[PDB]
């Protein structure tokens, strides 16, 4: 008789390397179904913000307008998703956008050579000002209540050092973007996570007593932080399972083929969540689980 | 010096029979990897537009570029909007006014249709002059079409070993299989 | 050491500053050589190339 209380008693978490950019927490005593559901929800369903509906006023750069628009769209912003509202998408364009459902960006860069240039110089910065166009050149000219709301939240790229385009003297670019909330599945541009995969905790089942220098070469096959040597009896043993990538290098050697079976536990998920600068991995994980809860509740409440 | 003309891209391929949408020679691209811009080849196409094809040496044509003093239909200034030619930056749909020439033979201006298949963007419109001292009114123009060819399904990709195949389906990234390191392969072959 | 190399520095330097001397990778020149040699020997010969003789 499996039950919620039994699951709660058996389930436990082990946060390993929590960071403002990356998370490496573990899930224990949970089913691959729920683990993969979380993985997929994090990768796709978790909402985020990215630029689209870009309007061009003028462009003459070598990079084409479509390429530039796509390149700008593939930028990580900083505003939290829980500050904006979805768009009905079946409205007139003037009504399609408001203060609280989108944000506006402007680039309007112009490039011209600076006469003061050292002789025999090939560096574009010295040869011409505005030689390169960076993300930080994007401004976030607000509208209406956005000025008050974003006072402590200036909309800046999560990575202002990215290279949108290169210019030349007499070369100018001027555009106008419109970032909205994304759903990830619509386009990878709306991906709050660089990658939210997981790996099952490797399991090493030592059968024979591995001793002597033969144990030392067995130690060599795995990554250094995995196998331990028992000083008491010169015995090889597992020190840290998480430290091992599934390499199967031992299987190549015939001596150890029968001495160990490289199994894998089935209820120990080593989650590893990178992120863009929009939100922290913990925040996006909580968003994912709450999204799953909302899905279940909506499915329950909608009648048949 | 082939590096000066690179073509293709390094792809994280997986020799795996997973989706089942590829048995003979089909292949599957990762949908997100496409959305990242996995391959974005574009088509540049130019055609020559002139009015002297019927003109002979000693007979200047009554028709020339531009349009005015007529009751020419409005809304042509959507993209056919200038004294002589359309704007460089525009999204030409089918049947859009490519260029307008004022004609005195009919005493009214006529335009040239797109007469193509895919909507395109104007990439470069250049003015060509006669080799002789035929100053006249420059009834010779060459324009360039930019066509964006994002890889849809059925577009033939290949490796450097004759293993050609078509894009069976843009498999969604979440449904794509992943590895221990978290990488999701972009190109799947059977 | 390494069997091959990307030569990224060389590629970027060449892209930024085209050579003002003998072009790199001469093999391409002596790959289109036959046509150029034919057309030159048409006029650049011991006596009026081949056109004057003809």
């Amino acid at each position: 008789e499996w039950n919620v209380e039994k699951f709660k008693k058996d389930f436990e978490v082990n946060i390993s390397s929590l960071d403002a950019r990356e998370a490496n927490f573990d899930l224990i005593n949970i089913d691959t179904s729920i683990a993969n559901a979380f993985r997929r929800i994090m990768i796709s369903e978790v909402p985020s913000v990215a630029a689209e509906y870009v309007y061009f006023f003028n462009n003459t750069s070598v990079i084409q307008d479509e390429v530039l628009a796509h390149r700008i769209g593939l930028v990580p912003l900083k505003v939290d998703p829980d500050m904006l509202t979805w768009v009905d998408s079946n409205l007139p364009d003037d009504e399609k956008f408001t203060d609280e459902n989108t944000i506006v960006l402007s680039l309007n860069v112009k490039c011209t050579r600076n006469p003061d240039a050292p002789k025999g110089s090939t560096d574009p910065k010295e040869l011409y000002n505005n030689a390169h166009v960076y993300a930080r050149d994007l401004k976030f000219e607000p509208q209406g209540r956005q000025s008050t709301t974003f006072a402590d939240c200036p909309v800046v790229p999560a990575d202002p050092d990215i290279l949108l385009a290169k210019l030349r003297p007499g070369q100018e670019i001027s555009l106008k973007a419109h970032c909205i909330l994304g759903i990830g599945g619509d386009h990878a541009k709306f991906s709050p996570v660089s990658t939210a995969s997981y790996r099952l905790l490797p399991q090493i089942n030592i059968l024979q007593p591995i001793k002597g220098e033969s144990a030392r070469r067995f130690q060599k096959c795995f990554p250094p932080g995995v196998i331990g040597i028992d000083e008491g009896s010169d015995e090889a043993y597992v020190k840290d399972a998480r430290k091992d990538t599934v390499s199967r290098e031992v299987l190549r050697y015939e001596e150890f083929a029968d001495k160990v079976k490289l199994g894998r536990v089935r209820n120990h998920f080593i989650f590893n969540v990178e992120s863009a600068g929009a939100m922290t991995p913990e925040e996006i994980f909580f968003k994912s689980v709450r999204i799953l809860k909302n899905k279940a509740e909506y499915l329950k409440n909608c009648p048949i | 010096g082939m590096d000066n003309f690179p073509n293709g891209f390094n792809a994280v391929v997986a020799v795996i029979s997973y989706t089942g949408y590829d048995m003979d020679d089909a292949m599957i691209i990762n949908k997100s990897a496409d959305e990242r811009g996995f391959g974005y080849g574009t088509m540049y196409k130019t055609e020559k537009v002139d009015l002297a094809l019927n003109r002979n040496r000693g007979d200047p044509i009554t028709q020339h570029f531009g349009f005015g003093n007529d009751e020419w239909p409005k809304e042509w200034l959507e993209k056919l909007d200038e004294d002589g030619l359309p704007y460089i930056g525009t999204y030409v749909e089918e049947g859009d006014p490519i260029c307008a020439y004022f004609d005195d033979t009919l005493n009214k201006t006529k335009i040239k249709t797109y007469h193509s298949s895919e909507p395109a963007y104007i990439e470069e419109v250049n003015l060509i002059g006669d080799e002789s001292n035929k100053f006249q009114e420059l009834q010779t123009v060459s324009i360039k079409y930019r066509i964006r060819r994002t890889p849809q399904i059925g577009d033939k990709f290949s490796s450097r070993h004759g293993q050609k195949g078509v894009c069976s389906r843009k498999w969604p990234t979440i449904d794509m299989p992943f590895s221990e390191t978290g990488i999701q392969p972009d190109i799947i072959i059977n | 050491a390494r069997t091959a190399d990307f030569r990224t520095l060389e590629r970027e330097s060449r892209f930024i500053n085209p050579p003002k001397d003998k072009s790199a990778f001469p093999l391409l020149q002596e790959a289109v050589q036959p046509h150029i040699g034919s057309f030159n020997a048409l006029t650049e010969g011991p006596d009026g190339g081949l056109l004057n003789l003809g």
């Binding site: 490496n24 080593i270 | 221990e180 | -």
Partner: peptide
């Protein structure tokens, strides 16, 4: 014949 001369990865969270 001389053979081709030789040339002289972490888990997640490590």
């Amino acid at each position: 014949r001389k053979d081709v001369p030789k040339v002289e990865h972490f888990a997640t969270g490590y």
